[PDB]
Swiss-Prot record:
Tissue expression summary: Highly expressed in estrogen receptor positive breast tumors and in osteosarcoma tumors.
Lineage of the species this protein comes from: Eukaryota, Metazoa, Chordata, Craniata, Vertebrata
Bromo domain segment(s): 3-114
Top-level taxonomic group: Eukaryota
Source organism: Homo sapiens (Human)
Name under which the protein is recorded: ATPase family AAA domain-containing protein 2
Cellular compartments annotated: Nucleus
Reported induction: Up-regulated in breast, uterus, colon, ovary, and stomach tumors. Induced in breast cancer cells overexpressing NCOA3 or treated with estrogen. Down-regulated in 5-fluorouracil-resistant derivatives of the colon cancer cell line HCT 116.
Subunit structure: Interacts with ESR1 and NCOA3 and these interactions are enhanced by estradiol. Interacts with acetylated lysine residues on histone H1.4, H2A, H2B and H3 (in vitro).
């Protein structure tokens, strides 16, 4: 129904706004765009499901997220990927892991503070009925 579509529209607005806030933080610049295969040619052979914040925006707009849970799975994916591709003790790797965990903790904290859990529960029930 139109009321359900209004719910999902509100969702998308919220998710764009959260995503924008992450994307403008200097720490998270490395996660804002797909890894360039010129610069990192083995990335797409190691990491099976690449994700980044621009692609997250594309997915919002394509209506791929009907719940905040589905969105956060993609945030987790950005983090997991970074942990997996940069697993060493060297400083570069430790910095990107640190930032990847901060990306995740920051997304969860914003959501905790700003997402009414009855709103999420509604989205989840509409989704289960489809």
């Amino acid at each position: 129904s139109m009321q359900e579509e209004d719910t999902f529209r509100e969702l998308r607005i919220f998710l764009r706004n959260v995503t924008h806030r992450l994307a403008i933080d200097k720490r998270f610049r490395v996660f804002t765009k797909p890894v360039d295969p010129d610069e990192v040619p083995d990335y797409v052979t190691v990491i099976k499901q690449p994700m980044d914040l621009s692609s997250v925006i594309s997915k919002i707009d394509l209506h791929k997220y009907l719940t905040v849970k589905d969105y956060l799975r993609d945030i987790d994916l950005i983090c997991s990927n970074a942990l997996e591709y940069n697993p060493d003790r060297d400083p570069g790797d430790r910095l990107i892991r640190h930032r990847a965990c901060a990306l995740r903790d920051t997304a969860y904290a914003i959501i905790k503070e700003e997402l009414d859990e009855d709103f999420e529960q509604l989205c989840e029930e509409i989704q289960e009925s489809r």
